[PDB]
Structure formats: C-alpha cells, structure tokens
Amino acid sequence: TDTTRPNHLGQEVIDNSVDEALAGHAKRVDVILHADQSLEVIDDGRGMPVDIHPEEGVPAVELILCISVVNALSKRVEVNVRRDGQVYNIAFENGEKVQDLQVVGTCGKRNTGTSVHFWPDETFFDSPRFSVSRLTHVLKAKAVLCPGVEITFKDEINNTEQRWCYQD
C-alpha cells in the first residue's frame, strides 16, 4: 500500500464494495469524503457477515477488519452492517477493537449492506489529505468496469456531489 497519501487505502475499501456489485448483489456504492478528511464507503451488498467464524471464534466481520489494511493504517475505523433486519456496529482505534459487535438498530429485511468509515493515521502518510482528482478518476473507471452499478461521490470538503452509471 502506497503511503504518499491515503488514496490507495480508500481504493482497497472501495474495491471490497465493488466486488459485491460485480457479484450482482450491490447496485450502488457511495463514497463520501468527510470534512475531517475521513472517508466513508457505503454499499448495498449482502453485508459483511457478523456470525461467528468457526476457527477463530469471533464475528467474521471482526476478524476481517482486524487483519485489514484500513485498520493497520487508520487511527479509527467504524463499521456498520445491515443484515437480517439488524444494524450491527463495531469500531477499532489505533488498530484495536474499542467496541464489540453490537446491534444498534433495526431495518427492513431487504435493506442490506456495509458501511466502512475510516480516519487515516496521519503519522503513516507523507500527507493525510485525500487527492480528490485521483479518487474520482479511479471511481469513474470503476463504474465503467462494473456496468450497472451506480457510484456516487460526495465531497464535504470542497462541497460537490457527483454520480455515474454505465448501463452496459
């Protein structure tokens, strides 16, 4: 992972969302660059499984995040999963789970998906600023290579919003 800036980190989180679209489960991926320079990636896929992983004995989502690159390079990572009518939440800080998986709400059974919100640890990057032009260029190409998915990008730092969808 490149540490010139947090873009590559974001693209890896975006790729996990797009993989759900490519598999035919997600129809939309939303990316939001927050005012505090944190990035949030939301998809309407199946939702990162929250049931126990046999070998490890911990929620699959907890395990995936624990070993993820976002967790390693972010001072904070908050994940919300919509699955089976339930909204599960879990968070890590400085690389450590600071909030066990827990049901924070309910939702429609058909409303599934995952939200990954992370705050890069500025100490690991030459620059903590996200390169917007680079983020949008890669996203657009992503929309192109995954026909049918609607990709939106909301920039709350430069106050702009865009959406792209390539039907075929």
Ligand SMILES: CO[C@@H]1[C@@H](OC(N)=O)[C@@H](O)[C@H](Oc2ccc3c(O)c(NC(=O)c4ccc(O)c(CC=C(C)C)c4)c(=O)oc3c2C)OC1(C)C
């Ligand atoms: C970083 O997590 C990624 C996902 O990222 C997002 N945003 O959804 C996505 O890329 C992909 O997500 C998958 C990949 C495979 C299945 C999949 O095979 C499912 N089918 C099941 O019936 C199932 C139900 C519960 C369960 O614990 C598992 C196995 C666990 C896995 C695949 C982590 C499978 C399912 O419900 O959801 C899935 C999901 C959401 O792979 C992950 C979990 C590594």
